[PDB]
Amino acid sequence: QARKLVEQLKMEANIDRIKVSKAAADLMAYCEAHAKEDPLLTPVPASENPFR
Amino acid sequence: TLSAEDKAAVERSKMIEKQLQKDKQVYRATHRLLLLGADNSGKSTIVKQMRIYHVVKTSGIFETKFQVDKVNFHMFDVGAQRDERRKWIQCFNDVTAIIFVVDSSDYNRLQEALNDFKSIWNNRWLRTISVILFLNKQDLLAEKVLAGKSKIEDYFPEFARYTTPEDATPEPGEDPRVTRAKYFIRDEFLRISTASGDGRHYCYPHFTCSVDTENARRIFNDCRDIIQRMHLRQYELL
Amino acid sequence: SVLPPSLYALVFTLGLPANLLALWAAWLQVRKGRELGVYLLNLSLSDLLLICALPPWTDYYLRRDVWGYGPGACRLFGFVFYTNLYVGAAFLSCVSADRYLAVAHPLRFPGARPIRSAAAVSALIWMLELAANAPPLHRDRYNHTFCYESYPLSGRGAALANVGRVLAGFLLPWGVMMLCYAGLLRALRGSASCEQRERRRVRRLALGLPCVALLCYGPYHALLLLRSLVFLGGCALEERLFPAYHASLALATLNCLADPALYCLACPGARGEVAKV
Amino acid sequence: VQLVESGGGLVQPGGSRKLSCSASGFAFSSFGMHWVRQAPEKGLEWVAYISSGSGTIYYADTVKGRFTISRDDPKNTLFLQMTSLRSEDTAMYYCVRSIYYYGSSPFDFWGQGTTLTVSASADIVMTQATSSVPGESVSISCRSSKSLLHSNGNTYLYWFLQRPGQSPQLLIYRMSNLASGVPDRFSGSGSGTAFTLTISRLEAEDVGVYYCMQHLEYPLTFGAGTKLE
Amino acid sequence: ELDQLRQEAEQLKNQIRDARKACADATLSQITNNIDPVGRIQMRTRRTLRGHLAKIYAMHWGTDSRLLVSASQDGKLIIWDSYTTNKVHAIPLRSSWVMTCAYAPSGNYVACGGLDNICSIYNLKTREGNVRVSRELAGHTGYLSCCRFLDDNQIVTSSGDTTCALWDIETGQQTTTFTGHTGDVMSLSLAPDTRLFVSGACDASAKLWDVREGMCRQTFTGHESDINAICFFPNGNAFATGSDDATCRLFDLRADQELMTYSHDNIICGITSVSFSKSGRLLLAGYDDFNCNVWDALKADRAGVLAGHDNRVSCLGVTDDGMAVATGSWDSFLKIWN
**Domains by residue range for chain E, with CATH:** 2-337 (2.130.10.10)
Q: Is E288 on the interface with B (CB under 8 A)?
A: no
Neighbours of E227 (CB within 10 A): 31
> Residue B97: which of B214, B4, B223 has the closest Cα?
B223
The residue extents of the domains of chain D are 1-119, 123-224
Question: What span, in angstroms and rounded, lies between the C-alpha atoms of E187 and E159?
Answer: 9
Phi and psi (nearest 5°) for E13? -65, -40
Tally C-beta pairs within 8 A across B and D: 45
Q: Is D31 on the interface with E (CB under 8 A)?
A: yes
- Please name the amino acid found at residue E177: T
Before B205, cis peptide (omega within 30)?
Answer: no
Residue in B closest to C112 by C-alpha: B25
Question: What span, in angstroms and rounded, lies between the C-alpha atoms of D102 and D110?
Answer: 21
Question: What span, in angstroms and rounded, lies between the C-alpha atoms of E304 and E325?
Answer: 13
**Domains by residue range for chain B, with CATH:** 33-234 (3.40.50.300)
* Contacting partners of chain C (3+ CB pairs under 8 A): B
Residue D139's contacts (CB-CB under 8 Å, 6 or more residues apart) are: D196, D197, D198
Asked if D27 and E67 come within 8 Å (Cβ–Cβ), the reply is: no
- Please name the amino acid found at residue E28: L
Asked if B232 and C266 come within 8 Å (Cβ–Cβ), the reply is: no
Asked if B3 and D152 come within 8 Å (Cβ–Cβ), the reply is: yes
**CB of E172 closer than 8 Å to CB of E137:** yes
Question: What span, in angstroms and rounded, lies between the C-alpha atoms of C37 and B35?
Answer: 35
Using only C-alpha atoms, chain D has a radius of gyration, in whole angstroms, of 17
Experimental method: cryo-EM
Residue D124 exposed, middle or buried by CB count within 10 Å (0-12, 13-18, 19+): middle
Question: What span, in angstroms and rounded, lies between the C-alpha atoms of E325 and E45?
Answer: 10
Asked if D102 and E86 come within 8 Å (Cβ–Cβ), the reply is: yes
Question: What span, in angstroms and rounded, lies between the C-alpha atoms of E200 and B182?
Answer: 45
* DSSP state at residue E130: S
E55 interaction partners in chain B (CB closer than 8 Å): 94
* DSSP state at residue E9: H
Q: Give me the residue from C98, C192, C198 closest to B238, CB to CB.
A: C198
Residue C124's contacts (CB-CB under 8 Å, 6 or more residues apart) are: none
> Residue C153: which of C161, C142, C143, C145 has the closest Cα?
C161
Residue B233 exposed, middle or buried by CB count within 10 Å (0-12, 13-18, 19+): middle
Phi and psi (nearest 5°) for E176? -145, 150
E6 interaction partners in chain A (CB closer than 8 Å): 2
Before D13, cis peptide (omega within 30)?
Answer: no
Q: Is B231 on the interface with C (CB under 8 A)?
A: yes
* DSSP state at residue E270: P
Phi and psi (nearest 5°) for D81? -95, 130
Instruction: Scan residues 258-277 of E and list those with Cβ closer than 8 Å to A.
Output: 259, 277
Q: Which of D108, D150, D155 to mutate to test the interface with B (most CBs of B within 10 A)?
A: D150
Question: Which string of DSSP letters, residue by residue, matches E25-89?
Answer: -S-HHHHHTTS---------EEEEE----S-EEEEEE-TTSSEEEEEETTTEEEEEETTTTEEEE
Asked if B11 and D56 come within 8 Å (Cβ–Cβ), the reply is: yes
CA of D100, closest CA in chain E: separation in Å?
A: 9
Question: What span, in angstroms and rounded, lies between the C-alpha atoms of E263 and E282?
Answer: 15
Asked if C193 and B235 come within 8 Å (Cβ–Cβ), the reply is: no
CA of B166, closest CA in chain E: separation in Å?
A: 44
**CB of D174 closer than 8 Å to CB of D213:** no
H/E segment holding residue E145: strand E144-149
Using only C-alpha atoms, chain B has a radius of gyration, in whole angstroms, of 22
Question: What span, in angstroms and rounded, lies between the C-alpha atoms of B87 and C48?
Answer: 50
Per the DSSP assignment, residues forming a β-bridge with E276 are E283
Q: Give me the residue from B3, B6, B8 closest to D51, CB to CB.
A: B8
**CB of B31 closer than 8 Å to CB of B130:** no
Q: Backbone breaks in chain D (C–N > 2.5 Å) follow which residues?
A: 120, 133
CA of E334, closest CA in chain A: separation in Å?
A: 15
Residues in chain E: 338
Question: What span, in angstroms and rounded, lies between the C-alpha atoms of C262 and C270?
Answer: 11
Instruction: Scan residues 179-218 of E and list those with Cβ closer than 8 Å to B.
Output: 183-184, 186, 202
Q: Is C98 on the interface with B (CB under 8 A)?
A: yes
Question: What span, in angstroms and rounded, lies between the C-alpha atoms of D206 and D186?
Answer: 10
Buried b (16+ CB within 10 A) or exposed e, B104-118: bbbbeebeebbebbe
Residue E1 exposed, middle or buried by CB count within 10 Å (0-12, 13-18, 19+): exposed
Three-state SS annotation for chain D? CEEEEECCCEECCCCCEEEEEEEECCCHHHCEEEEEEECCCCCEEEEEEECCCCCCEEECHHHCCCEEEEEECCCCEEEEEECCCCHHHCEEEEEEEECCCCCCCCCCEECCCEEEEECCCCCCCEEECCCCCCCCCECCEEEECCCCECCCCCECEEEEEECCCCCCEEEEECCCEECCCCCCCEEEEECCCEEEEEECCCCHHHCEEEEEEECCCCCCCCCCCEEEC
Residue C79's contacts (CB-CB under 8 Å, 6 or more residues apart) are: C133, C134, C136, C137
**CB of E55 closer than 8 Å to CB of E330:** yes
Interface of B with D (CB under 8 A): 2-9, 11-12, 14-15
Instruction: Scan residues 298-327 of E and list those with Cβ closer than 8 Å to A.
Output: 298, 318, 321-325
Q: Is E81 on the interface with B (CB under 8 A)?
A: yes
Please say whether the structural domain C3-276 has been given the CATH code 3.40.50.300: no
A26 interaction partners in chain E (CB closer than 8 Å): 235, 237, 254
Are chains A and C in touch, 3+ Cβ pairs below 8 Å? no
Query: Could you tell me where the DSSP H helices lie in B122-175?
Result: 138-147
> Residue E317: which of E190, E231, E226, E225 has the closest Cα?
E231
Query: Resolution of the deposited coordinates, in angstroms?
Result: 3.0
Per the DSSP assignment, residues forming a β-bridge with E317 are E326
Q: Is E244 on the interface with B (CB under 8 A)?
A: no
Residue B219 exposed, middle or buried by CB count within 10 Å (0-12, 13-18, 19+): buried
Phi and psi (nearest 5°) for D218? -75, 150
Asked if C192 and B225 come within 8 Å (Cβ–Cβ), the reply is: yes
Per the DSSP assignment, residues forming a β-bridge with D55 are none
Asked if A28 and E336 come within 8 Å (Cβ–Cβ), the reply is: no
Query: Could you tell me where the DSSP H helices lie in chain E?
Result: 2-23, 28-32
Q: Is B20 on the interface with C (CB under 8 A)?
A: no
Per the DSSP assignment, residues forming a β-bridge with E262 are E248
Q: Which of E49, E56, E67, E96 to mutate to test the interface with B (most CBs of B within 10 A)?
A: E96
Are chains E and D in touch, 3+ Cβ pairs below 8 Å? yes
Asked if E9 and A20 come within 8 Å (Cβ–Cβ), the reply is: no
**CB of C90 closer than 8 Å to CB of C125:** yes
Residue A48's contacts (CB-CB under 8 Å, 6 or more residues apart) are: none
- Residue D138 exposure: Cα atoms within 13 Å on the Cβ side: 17
**CB of D147 closer than 8 Å to CB of D192:** yes
A19 interaction partners in chain E (CB closer than 8 Å): 23, 25, 255
Asked if C110 and B28 come within 8 Å (Cβ–Cβ), the reply is: yes
H/E segment holding residue B63: strand B61-68
- Please name the amino acid found at residue D81: Q
Question: What span, in angstroms and rounded, lies between the C-alpha atoms of E292 and E273?
Answer: 9
Question: Which string of DSSP letters, residue by residue, matches chain C?
Answer: --HHHHHHHHHHHHHHHHHHHHHHHHHHHHTT--HHHHHHHHHHHHHHHHHHHHHHHHHHHHTTTS--S-SSTTHHHHHHHHHHHHHHHHHHHHHHHHHHHHHH-TTSSS-S-HHHHHHHHHHHHHHHHHHHHSTT----SSS---TT--SS-S-TTTTHHHHHHIIIIIIHHHHHHHHHHHHHHHHGGG-SS--HHHHHHHHHHHTTHHHHHHHHHSHHHHHHHHHHHHH--HHHHHHHHHHHHHHHHHHHTTHHHHHHHHHTSSSHHHHHHHHH-
Q: Between helices C35-62 and C75-104, what is the axis angle to 10°?
A: 150
Q: Which of E323, E325, E335 to mutate to test the interface with A (most CBs of A within 10 A)?
A: E323
Asked if E237 and A38 come within 8 Å (Cβ–Cβ), the reply is: no
Q: Is the dihedral of CA E67, D100, D61, D112 positive or negative?
A: positive
> Residue D199: which of D161, D225, D165 has the closest Cα?
D161
> DSSP 3-state assignment of B204?
strand
Asked if D26 and E89 come within 8 Å (Cβ–Cβ), the reply is: no
Q: Give me the residue from B27, B78, B87 closest to E202, CB to CB.
A: B87
Asked if E86 and B13 come within 8 Å (Cβ–Cβ), the reply is: yes
**CB of E153 closer than 8 Å to CB of E169:** yes
Are chains A and D in touch, 3+ Cβ pairs below 8 Å? no
Residue C96's contacts (CB-CB under 8 Å, 6 or more residues apart) are: C176, C177, C180, C181, C209, C210
Asked if E28 and A51 come within 8 Å (Cβ–Cβ), the reply is: no
B15 interaction partners in chain D (CB closer than 8 Å): 52-53, 55
Residue in D closest to E130 by C-alpha: D27
Question: What span, in angstroms and rounded, lies between the C-alpha atoms of E243 and E222?
Answer: 11
> Residue E131: which of D177, D26, D97 has the closest Cα?
D26
Asked if E127 and D26 come within 8 Å (Cβ–Cβ), the reply is: yes
Question: What span, in angstroms and rounded, lies between the C-alpha atoms of C116 and C132?
Answer: 24
Residue D87 exposed, middle or buried by CB count within 10 Å (0-12, 13-18, 19+): exposed
